[PDB]
């Protein structure tokens, strides 16, 4: 019930490495600023999964926190040479990006991250598979997948696509085809672990496991309402600190509370903590679980 959808834990950086153009307004990402790579994540009717899970991290924040690696090149330019590795994974995807956007990032196959790049002044289209010519053009990127990042270091490189009766989904060449193969764009779940491939899913069992973590509390600065305030300036239990801080039982159980003798009010975020996954009957912890609309080839005959 807490309307803290703009407060980002950790550091609050959303600009990606490759399109560092909107870094003047999204640093740090807080209640202020009009970052094009975060405004569409909270609009009603776009990515409801991130609307349900918004107190954690994103894919960009995971890249900045040394969680999700970047491919080579991390931002494949669309107007340069003749062939780039960041195209076979883009044409198979079918999304809907609004107008006035230059870049569009997505998830690759090797577990890293690869985005596109268009030289000025090129904008996207209704699908984003190709950047054509020309409000003003946003100097950022549009999230092509409905996923969310989180702090995790669970290893899982010995798992592959767990989909039965599927020929070649996305760009992964699984099993061969001998009869009728479909090609309809359907949603498929996936979950990439640490240093692994784009592992798809079939049965998802999400849950909420909260824990007393420093990156699970939100707060706003008080002054003569929601204001930006760094959480790292909160003293510990009898430790030290620069300014002051206070909160409820969750925020005051681990940090020091001074009641009215502070400048903010730290509150525990609803659902923030540890979000595990149940794949192959074994409870695991993913990194950036989400959905995507790629080309699914199912063997009907």
């Amino acid at each position: 019930e807490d309307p803290h959808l703009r407060n980002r834990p950790g550091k609050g950086h959303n600009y990606i490495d490759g399109m560092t153009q909107e870094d003047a307004t999204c640093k740090p990402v807080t209640y202020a600023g009009a970052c094009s790579s975060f405004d569409v994540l909270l609009e009603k009717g776009k990515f409801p999964l991130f609307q349900s899970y918004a107190h954690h991290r994103t894919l960009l924040e995971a890249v900045h926190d040394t969680i999700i690696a970047k491919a080579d090149p991390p931002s494949c330019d669309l107007q340069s040479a003749h062939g780039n590795p960041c195209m076979k994974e883009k044409l198979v995807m079918k999304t809907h990006c609004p107008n006035d956007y230059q870049s569009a990032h997505y998830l690759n196959n090797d577990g890293k991250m690869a985005s596109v790049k268009c030289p000025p002044k090129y904008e996207l289209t209704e699908d984003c598979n190709f950047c054509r010519q020309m409000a003003s053009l946003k100097k950022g990127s549009y999230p092509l997948q409905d996923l969310f990042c989180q702090s995790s270091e669970d290893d899982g490189s010995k798992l592959k696509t767990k989909m039965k009766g599927v020929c070649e989904v996305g760009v992964q060449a699984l099993k061969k085809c001998d009869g009728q193969l479909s090609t309809a764009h359907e949603v498929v779940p996936f979950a990439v672990f640490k240093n692994s491939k784009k592992v798809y899913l079939d049965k998802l069992d999400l849950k909420t496991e909260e824990n007393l973590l420093p990156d699970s509390f939100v707060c706003f600065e008080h002054k003569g309402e929601l204001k930006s305030f760094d959480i790292s300036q909160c003293p510990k239990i009898g430790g030290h600190g620069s300014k002051k801080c206070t909160g409820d039982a969750a925020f005051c159980s681990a940090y020091e509370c001074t009641a009215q003798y502070a400048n903010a009010y730290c509150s525990h975020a609803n659902g923030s903590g540890i979000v595990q996954i149940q794949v192959s009957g074994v409870w695991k912890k993913p990194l950036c679980v989400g959905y995507e609309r790629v080309v699914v080839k199912r063997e009907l005959s």
Partner: protein, 216 residues
Amino acid sequence: TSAEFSFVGESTTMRENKCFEQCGGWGCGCFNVNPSCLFVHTYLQSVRKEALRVFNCIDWVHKLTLEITDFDGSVSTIDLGASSSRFTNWGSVSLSLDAEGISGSNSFSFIESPGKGYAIVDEPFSEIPRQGFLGEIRCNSESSVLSAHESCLRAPNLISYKPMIDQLECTTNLIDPFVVFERGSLPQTRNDKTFAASKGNRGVQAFSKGSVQADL
């Protein structure tokens, strides 16, 4: 379907949205002491690749497959039963006398299997579905069984749920039609006739004895 499962996607499939309540506290995750909720989104999925069309027969029409030869040479193959009519190149044809009929077939249901044989069931036709009876989950076409269309009719509260804190087991007790299909597979000894499949035209027939007494 609120924001808890709106990101899954729309699909024409007989699905349902439930809601349960487990426990809270720090033993499983949650800053409030109140018990947490448990939203369940269960949808049907046909694990097989074959479909069956269960029908019945209220009367046995004595069909006579006639191969009428025209005057010019256009040989056509038609059929006549009881008092039916067809179309030919020279006009039409109908059946007059037909004193060969068997009554009392409402207490038997038939199952059609494309590719394989047919079957017979020693029970009357199923009209209204209910739990613990042959003919629960039904539809209206082949895509309603293979692709599981949401237009198919079914009984409410047909999916059981056994939650285990962080586990979920949503299973049903649907009667496998292939069990009865393999148990009562044609041919079967019923009264004094032989029931089997038909030739040329798709349907059920019967093998009787005697002669052919009719008027064309």
